[PDB]
């Protein structure tokens, strides 16, 4: 009886840490608004109407959001799918051309600058012999002076032909659920005070992830998942100042953003079946597009993140907020996409505070670019068509991406600057709970039963 | 009975439990293991990967003493030098992932012992039927 | 289909008897009329409501047979 015999059990619940390819699955409600209005409304299996998470018992696994897989997979999938929604659309090959630009008709201030240049140019008609003279409106940030006369050109004339985005398809986010194939499972940590590294005490398996609205936001990540009860800061290594700090707070901050300039879409015929959508007349006043937050909720939430930031640096610490230090446009200013229109808004009015260890609304101006160089590819730029009417959007600032400055030489205070940097910092604020594990059945254990021959 | 509730004992629900708890529910975990323009190629690669794994496990079971059963006794004695822990503490206390990380060194030796015992059982069964 | 058969009382055989009694409340038709007269599609559309219950009964009977077989070998 003391001599035991081996037994193999198949279907034993035990998993290992693994790296596989999860498959996207959007909701069928977006298929109801059909005909290629966004990406993945036709290239995605429809969701399960009962996402079935199963709460476990007496179990503890160690997680790591920073060496995690499937954030890289989300990045690669969104980049490649973004590239895939440009091949049916039009290349602007006959548009990199000599542009005769003047000032826009406006009461000109010599100290300031007009942000619109009115450019007329030669364009080929649908017929190859006849060419026409057609005019349009652009911003300063898309044209440059080539070297009396004043002739301009597009800024991307010497790197790439800009694929015009299809005006049929839109850029609003829809929730994608990444579902694991058979043999794999997804574990989500339901602990409240979980800083995204180390053993989590209450995990639960699920077949598909929750709603991830994919936002394009460098600083001040939008439409995220709110924290449970308090502000939570997360980093891979706090004393590392080259590692970004993800701040996710509890109550959202409402932010309004608008362009008040009323624009006119005008079609120009490039060739047979080729349409170029330009800006026509500016109906009304020439104003600066901007955004608003509440003063009191911003001051309160900065007090909250100060209260949480003093847990990592001691109590007697002076915390100040200063603006971004410098770089390109979309890493020093916060950039986002308000319904197919790209704003680049100044965040100097927000990170301008100091904090000691004892009805109004902040408005901030923006710039508007039409051509973008998203993910900074070597030969891939993209024009964006103008859209009609006054454009406004309401969003919720959910978190921050901060960076501690290079403190040495007896630093009494510690300052924090905003900075977007890599886009993967945005996606790690949403896949921080989940991990992907491989189910390996067929365990083996001894018992006191030998097989009868 | 009117007024009838239900707990939906789903897939992968006996992780932290003891061995004898998971031994009842393992059948549904074995059942859920299978089913589940470039994106079709990715999902196809994932699906045929899943069936590659399932067929690998079915073949690895089949050369042992059981073809399609889920519980299987063999004729190889449990070497006490592997884990030297007796019946009650491994059948009542220990969890599964702990049991995985306790004997993750002698697994291949156990595989070879099972295969050799099954093959000599094959030749003994073929020779028992030789004299008939 | 192979996996759905395999958790039941037969692994790869095509004919399979089990230890679950046929509940007469399902169809209440005796042996001769269902073995000589009735067709297959008719038999499909006659008991297309209790099929999952039959699946669960087979699975529970096979699993308790597994634990009884494992306990029969316990004393040996």
């Amino acid at each position, epitope marked *: 009886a003391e001599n035991l015999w081996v037994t193999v059990y198949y279907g034993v619940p035990v998993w290992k840490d693994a790296e596989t390819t999860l498959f996207c699955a959007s909701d069928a409600k977006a298929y109801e608004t059909e005909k290629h209005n966004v990406w993945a409304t036709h290239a995605c299996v429809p969701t399960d109407p009962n996402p079935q998470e199963i709460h476990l018992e007496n179990v503890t696994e160690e997680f790591n959001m920073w060496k995690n897989n499937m954030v890289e997979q989300m990045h690669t999938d969104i980049i490649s799918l973004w590239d895939q929604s440009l091949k049916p659309c039009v290349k602007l090959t006959p548009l990199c051309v000599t542009l005769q630009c003047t000032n826009v008709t406006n009461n000109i201030t010599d100290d300031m600058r007009g942000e619109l240049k009115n450019c007329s140019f030669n364009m080929t008609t649908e017929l190859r012999d006849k060419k026409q003279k057609v005019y349009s409106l652009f911003y300063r940030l898309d044209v440059v002076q080539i070297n009396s006369n004043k002739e301009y050109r597009l800024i991307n004339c010497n790197t790439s032909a800009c694929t015009q985005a299809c005006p049929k398809v839109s850029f609003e986010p829809i929730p994608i659920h990444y579902c694991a194939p058979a043999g794999f499972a997804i574990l989500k940590c339901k602990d409240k005070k979980f800083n995204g590294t180390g053993p989590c005490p209450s995990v639960s398996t699920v077949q598909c992830t929750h709603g991830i609205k994919p936002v394009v936001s460098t600083q001040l990540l939008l439409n995220g998942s709110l924290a449970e009860e308090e502000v939570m800061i997360r980093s891979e290594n706090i004393t590392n100042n080259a590692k970004n700090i993800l701040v996710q707070f509890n109550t959202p901050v409402q932010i309004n953003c608008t362009r008040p300039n009323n624009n006119t879409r005008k079609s120009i015929r490039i060739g047979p079946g080729q349409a170029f959508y330009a800006t026509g007349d500016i109906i009304g006043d020439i104003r600066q597009a901007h955004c608003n937050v509440s003063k009191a909720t911003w001051n309160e939430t900065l007090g909250k993140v100060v209260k949480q930031l003093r847990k990592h640096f001691g109590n007697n610490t002076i915390i100040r907020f200063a603006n971004s230090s410098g770089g390109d446009l979309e890493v020093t200013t916060h950039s986002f996409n308000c319904g197919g229109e790209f704003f680049y808004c100044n965040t100097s009015g927000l990170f301008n505070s100091t904090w000691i260890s004892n009805n109004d609304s902040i408005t901030l101006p923006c710039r508007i670019k039409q051509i973008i160089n998203m993910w900074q590819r070597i030969g891939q730029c993209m024009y964006a068509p103008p859209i009609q009417g006054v454009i406004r959007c309401v969003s919720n600032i959910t978190g921050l991406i901060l960076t501690r400055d290079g403190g040495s030489t007896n630093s009494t205070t510690e300052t924090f600057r905003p900075g977007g940097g890599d886009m993967r910092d945005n996606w790690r604020s949403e896949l921080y709970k989940y991990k992907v594990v491989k189910i390996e059945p067929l365990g083996v254990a001894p018992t006191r039963c030998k097989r009868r021959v | *009975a009117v007024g009838i509730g*239900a707990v939906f*004992l789903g897939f992968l629900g006996a992780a932290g439990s003891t061995m004898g708890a998971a031994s009842m529910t393992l059948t549904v975990q074995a059942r859920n293991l299978l089913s589940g323009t470039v994106w079709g190629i990715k999902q196809l690669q994932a699906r045929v990967l899943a069936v590659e794994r399932y067929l690998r496990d079915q073949q690895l079971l089949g050369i042992w003493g059981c073809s399609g059963k889920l519980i299987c006794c063999t004729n190889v004695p449990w070497n006490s030098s592997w884990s030297n822990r007796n019946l009650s503490e491994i059948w009542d206390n220990m969890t599964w992932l702990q049991w995985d990380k306790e004997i993750s060194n002698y697994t291949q030796i156990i595989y070879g012992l099972l295969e050799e015992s099954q093959n000599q059982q094959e030749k003994n069964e073929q020779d028992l039927l030789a004299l008939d | 289909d192979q996996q759905l058969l395999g958790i039941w009382g037969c692994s790869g055989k095509l004919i399979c008897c089990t230890n679950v009694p046929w509940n007469s409340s399902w169809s209440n038709r005796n042996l001769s009329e269902i073995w000589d007269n009735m067709t297959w599609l008719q038999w499909d559309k006659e008991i297309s409501n209790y099929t999952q219950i039959i699946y669960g009964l087979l699975e529970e009977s096979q699993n308790q047979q597994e634990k009884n077989e494992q306990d029969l070998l316990a004393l040996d």
Partner: antibody
Amino acid sequence: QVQLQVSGPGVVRPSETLSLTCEVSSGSTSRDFFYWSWVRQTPGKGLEWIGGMYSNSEETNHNPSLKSRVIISKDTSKNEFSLRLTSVTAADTAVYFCSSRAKIYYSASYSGGRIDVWGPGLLVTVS
Amino acid sequence: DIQMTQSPSSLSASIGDRVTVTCRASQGIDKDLSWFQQKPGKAPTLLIYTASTLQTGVSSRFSGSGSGTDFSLTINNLQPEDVATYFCQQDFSFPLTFGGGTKVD
């Protein structure tokens, strides 16, 4: 406290509202559902079921021997099963149990077992 | 409502006797009867569900027979942990009516 622990006031004034809460919990799945039930144990009579409600819906199923005088509510977020018995006389002096009502079935077809365990009660006296 | 009568109120037996508790119903509750064990002062815990199926956790001493309106719980080898009030529960139709109580001394 233990599972299905009933707490609240132990003395109810005459013809006021008895209001008791009970530590309930969610199931192992979001697909699960319980029926939480108030039962009283009287010295005079036996065990008497007071009422209850599904965890899925908000409909209340109760014993009409108390003549629809109960307000049976729940808060799954706050682990609350609540009885608000109204017009409480001394006949409702009893030890109240709150019970979980569910089945333990194993795989998606069959029934496999029912668990109707109770938690330790709280004596409520009306005078 | 469906009346449930449990008998006896109390039954006395020595250590190791097979005793029987008889639960009768007024109407058809065919196999919807539960058997519960309650320590004096403590909560009733489950013994038998569906009137013939042994619940996992309690021993094989608690067995159940009967059908329709009449059921009988059976205790083989009566134990000192069997000192408890037993209750048979109807769960066939609303409302839930339970037994009278059977004490073991």
